């Protein structure tokens, strides 16, 4: 199939933090990209090109460490270096909450309806019920180093977390009568696991990717614990996304090519490589229609690739 070798757009990302563990971009269901540039968050409306500086941190030294849109796209969660999880209403352009519970920077976030899960450099994961005063409703402690990857499954039955301790944990949706204990703990990656993504059409299928010392994409069945595939990408794997229409996966990489790789699922055959970034890719996010992937890189650019469409 025809995949364009050039991106559809190249947006300037001056002052983007070249820190592997941070999750600095997210594309809303309302077709708005949120991009964290140092101490500010900018919003770019894909349909009009309008840009808004939503917020800026108020104290010296503070920087944005994560962003994540709620499913409806009206609220943006913003994790900070000062261990806060802020909740912004982007229609009103105002901060609704400043949730403190963490002891260190909040580098990862994932929503499950009104529950927002936040992962910290401390190794802990907190569940926040953003609708209520006592927001901190659970603590999940299965990592000894920074939680850099965090993703609820689309059906809300599992939460996956990846850490700088080379572990992947698969958590249940509720503690039940027991405690918050992982259903699965995968130790096979030999490097940090920032890339965590669930298969949109298969409830229990998860893809994870490891850092420079690992370089592999692994596919798992979280019910059986099976590792269905382990593929060497020859570079750190910062992010993985699944196409919800083509039965393909896309991954972002660093040294030496700083490319995105498209893979055919389930064969894991390499379909294409998107080249152009001149420094390592930091994060990927996908448009709500599934057609475009935005890659944020250390070269201070956001490249938007229309790699899953012909129109």
């Amino acid at each position: 199939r025809y995949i364009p070798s050039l991106p559809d757009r190249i947006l300037d990302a001056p002052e983007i933090r070249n820190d592997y563990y941070l999750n600095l971009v997210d594309w809303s269901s309302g077709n708005v990209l949120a991009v964290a540039l140092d101490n500010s968050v900018y919003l770019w409306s894909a349909s009009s090109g309008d840009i808004l500086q939503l917020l800026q941190m108020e104290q010296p030294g503070e920087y944005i460490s994560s962003v994540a849109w709620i499913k409806e796209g009206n609220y943006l969660a913003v994790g900070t270096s000062s261990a806060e999880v802020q909740l912004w209403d982007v229609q009103q352009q105002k901060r609704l909450r400043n949730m403190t519970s963490h002891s260190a920077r909040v580098g990862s976030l994932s929503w499950n309806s009104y529950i927002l899960s936040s992962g910290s450099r401390s190794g802990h994961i907190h569940h926040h019920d953003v609708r209520v005063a006592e927001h901190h409703v659970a603590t999940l402690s299965g990592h000894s180093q920074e939680v850099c990857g965090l993703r609820w499954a689309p059906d809300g039955r599992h939460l996956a977390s990846g850490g700088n301790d080379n572990l992947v944990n698969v958590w249940p949706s509720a503690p039940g009568e027991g405690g918050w204990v992982p259903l699965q703990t995968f130790t096979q990656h030999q490097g940090a696991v920032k890339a965590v993504a669930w298969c949109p059409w298969q409830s229990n299928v998860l893809a994870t990717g490891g850092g420079t010392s690992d370089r592999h994409i692994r596919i798992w069945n979280v019910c059986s614990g099976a590792c269905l595939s382990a593929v060497d990408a020859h570079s750190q794997v910062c992010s993985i996304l699944w196409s919800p229409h083509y039965k393909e996966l896309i991954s972002g990489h660093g040294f030496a090519q700083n490319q995105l790789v498209i893979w055919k699922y389930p064969t894991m055959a390499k379909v294409a490589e998107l080249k152009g970034h001149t420094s390592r890719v930091l994060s990927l996010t996908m448009s709500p229609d599934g057609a475009t992937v935005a890659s944020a890189a250390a070269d201070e650019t956001l490249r938007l690739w229309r790699c899953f469409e012909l129109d």
Binding site: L11, D12, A13, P14, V35, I51
Partner: peptide
């Protein structure tokens, strides 16, 4: 350098 500009 305007942020997010083309």
């Amino acid at each position: 350098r305007a942020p997010x500009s083309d």
